[PDB]
Write a protein that binds this ligand. Sequence first.
Ligand SMILES: Nc1nc2c(ncn2[C@@H]2O[C@H](COP(=O)(O)OP(=O)(O)NP(=O)(O)O)[C@@H](O)[C@H]2O)c(=O)[nH]1
Ligand SMILES: [Mg+2]
Lengths: 503, 178
Amino acid sequence: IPFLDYKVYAERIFFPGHRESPLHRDLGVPESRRPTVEQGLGQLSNLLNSKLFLTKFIHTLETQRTFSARDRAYVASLLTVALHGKLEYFTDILRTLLSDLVAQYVAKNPKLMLRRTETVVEKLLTNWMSICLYTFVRDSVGEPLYMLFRGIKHQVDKGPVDSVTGKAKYTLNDNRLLREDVEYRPLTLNALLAVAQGVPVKVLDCDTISQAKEKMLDQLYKGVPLTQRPDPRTLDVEWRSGVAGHLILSDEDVTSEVQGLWRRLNTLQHYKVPDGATVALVPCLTGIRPWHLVKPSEIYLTRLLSMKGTLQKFVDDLFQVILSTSRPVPLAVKYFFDLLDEQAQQHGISDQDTIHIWKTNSLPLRFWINIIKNPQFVFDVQTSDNMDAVLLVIAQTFMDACTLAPINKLLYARDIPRYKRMVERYYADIRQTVPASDQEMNSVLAELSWNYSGDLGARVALHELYKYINKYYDQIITALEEDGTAQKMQLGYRLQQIAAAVE
Amino acid sequence: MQAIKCVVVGDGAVGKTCLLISYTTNAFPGEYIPTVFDNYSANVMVDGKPVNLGLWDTAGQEDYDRLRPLSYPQTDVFLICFSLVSPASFENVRAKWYPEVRHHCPNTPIILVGTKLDLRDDKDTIEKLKEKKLTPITYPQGLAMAKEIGAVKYLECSALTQRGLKTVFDEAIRAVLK
Ligand SMILES: Nc1nc2c(ncn2[C@@H]2O[C@H](COP(=O)(O)OP(=O)(O)NP(=O)(O)O)[C@@H](O)[C@H]2O)c(=O)[nH]1
Ligand SMILES: [Mg+2]
């Protein structure tokens, strides 16, 4: 069961788009001015540990016109990596930032709360949750989440697949559903890994030599995590016949099907490969439109229900674990939903329906939604495109159950009133159980700076955070001295000293 | 140490697999099974020089045609085949084989080879030939074919007897060296 360790899980959650944490690279400072800068950054960290400073810092950036919501994510994520030590403080930074968001939503519409990252705090609590719940995820939810992922992977390949458009016999989305049907026969060929023991692999005559290579690897390295698995671009498919076989087939070669501007890919049926063929994955030697089953340029309820119906098995289970009352309420959840309940009475909101959407767009629609949506956050796995369309349609099914109010709606319409029960059933425990003491809380928050193995990239985090400071320097000086306590703290000068320490 | 890649392309059941096996084991197969893409190996001595002959069997069926071109790259010497006991297998030399070979490899030397020599001289075989109103291939019929295609030699042989089969490959080794 390929579980990503905390380092990977966190990096992938805080820094998603780049794939790998951009906090892994050297500062880009020469050996000469190298020690003079390294020191300055340290003083930036001590400056950040001032709740008085930090609050003003973010508030100034949020107001800037040039500060995109893309920066809002990066700044929250850098700050998360930065304050990974002072977690007790990181929570206080949020405790304070939450109360600020609360007052701002009273004027316009309080129901629209925590919908889009138009604020930096919206990202910090997704990061916050992730830090807290990582244990729980690995410990309980991990299991059915992996199950559903293997289940979907399996159930899709029991049907043909177009290596070009990206459509299959099975999915939960018409925008991805393979409308046309093709002539496909099932193959079950003995696969060898000659990089020598033979593992039987189940492909389909229609699969390209590429898809067939992947399907082969999936069995030849069943429980080996992606990073431990070798690269497929280093591998070549080699068929075997008679005394000495030896024939290296490929996706596109001498035997490719050119039809003017339409060149087809090479399949197993294309080469006349039979059942039980000895195929070995051996190392690599080294404007016509490409196609496979349907050349590129209404619902089909019946087709999707077969797929839903297969996957229901673990769909039920995954939700029955996330929304579990049988297990006790994790402290991070209970604390937070009571952190909101403390805020609800401070501004006078008796309406629990307004409270629920702040509660929903916190833990499930902030956190749980993402893990269902994207499983590459917990598992060292390669996620298919059609896989994601399926998973997303399971996340939009879970989501419709969370919130009190197309395909996904009148598809799971049978199970959606069942999950709506589970949501309320879960929020019953949230209030009925013993509230979590802050004395008892920071006890857990400290052991998380402990159990966080190493440096997630804090060096770069401070340098990258200074890259921001450097651009918005003066606008910061404004809030640095317009405040009375900020003058007393000598914050302005503290910053100035660091500013010169870098340059 | 010079290695010679030799590909034997020939019509359905001309006796390639058999002639390839006979040369490398000095034993005849017996049973017919249509070959897909089989590889053979032999270490020879021609004019006081050691050579590794890396043989390549191919198909004589239109079914395994979508795959045959893969055997072709970097071939040092080709072996275009036919059976002396069928002119159908001989006419397909000018029709299927020669065109296919040169379409890909325009420099590789060809050697037209007449397999099943033992059956040509047999009476009982000529009886079946006469029944479908046909006559077997002779040395001048084949020598006219080899000069026509641009073959570097014409060799007649048989796999069950090993008659002039030794020569067939020794000549193919010579066909590379100059
Ligand atoms: N009498 C005699 N029979 C032969 C000789 N060579 C081949 N045969 C026969 O004719 C058939 C040839 O088998 P085979 O070698 O596989 O022909 P092939 O050209 O390799 N077939 P393929 O096209 O599938 O590669 C067999 O039934 C065999 O008994 C020969 O020299 N003498
Ligand atoms: Mg054969």
